[PDB]
């Protein structure tokens, strides 16, 4: 990964924009000018934000780079960085870098910024336990399991992601600055022990429950918990609902596809003050009852309106053959389970049988 003769910058740095970056760094007149390994060895820092760079191919010839500012470019592959053993500060905001495995051998990396990169999988960060600052805001992260190994972090931004489980943070007692706004957090117990926090942000938590059936009298557990595990009393409840601790209750005489409640809780951890504020959203399914009538005996099943009914195993009546399920007793329309949709009301389907042939 070295040049042994004078070589044009453009020959090493194949991305035309990155080549211009090196030319300017070395105070050269043209990307056709030849450079030497000694000149490449002299580069300690590259500042090339918002420079339309698609590839840093060639950077592997710069063994002594310690600081790399590459925010606002068009990068995807960062494999050319893999062996920059002295890299200490890496800023890659607003690119499309997802393959964090290229970082695994950067054991002197102290600060890593990867905001707005579309990242969901950060498991590659397990190989960087020495990190002190990590910026991952505005991504698509759900699973931060790996962060329990990053016991040297004092600054961690996970804001604007999709995180609900923050238990992996519970042991990171060195944290001083923790940005968690715009996630899916409903349970703050994981934060209780972070006694060194100076800055904490917990605004705008959007918590989505799995759908349940609509009912006239609905009950949903309050799942919002403070650092001590106690329930946060709702600030306001949709659809004229009420709080009967520990449950939220509604009377819903007409179907609606959602109820919700909002919560607000001032939080103090260490020296940090925060406002835990968010909404719990409960989707509701519009369900009615299909009654299967088999010669006067009934089995009931609940089905969501506007969906297809899954036909039951057909009845077996000694001496007869099952014909089908019909909308009237001894007559009507034969239900077609592949084309007829569940209606917006309870109704009965009647088993009709026919003679053995």
Author numbering: 36 to 392
What does the paper say about this structure?
InlB, an invasion protein from the facultative intracellular pathogen Listeria monocytogenes, is a multi-domain protein that binds and activates the human receptor tyrosine kinase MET. The N-terminal internalin domain (amino acids 36–321; InlB321) is characterized by a central leucine-rich repeat (LRR) region that binds to the first Ig-like IPT domain of MET with high affinity. The LRR region is flanked N-terminally by a helical cap and C-terminally by an Ig-like inter-repeat (IR) region. The B repeat folds into a compact domain resembling a β-grasp fold.
InlB392_T332E, an InlB392 variant with a single Thr-to-Glu substitution in the B repeat, readily yielded single crystals of varying morphologies in several conditions from the commercial MORPHEUS screen and a homemade PEG smear screen. The best crystal from condition D3 of the PEG smear (low- and broad-molecular-weight) screen (crystal form II) was a rod with a cross section of about 35 × 35 µm and a length of about 180 µm. This crystal diffracted to 1.8 Å resolution. The packing of InlB392_T332E crystal form II is different. The contact area is between 397 and 647 Å2, with a mean of 549 Å2, according to the PISA server. This crystal contact is not present in crystal form II of InlB392_T332E. The largest difference between these distances is found for InlB392_T332E crystal form II. The crystal structures presented in this work provide additional and conclusive proof that the T332E mutation does not change the structure of the B repeat. Therefore, the negative effect of this substitution in cellular assays is most likely due to the destruction of a binding site, preventing the interaction with a functionally important binding partner. Secondly, the contact between the B repeat and the IR region is formed regardless of the T332E mutation.
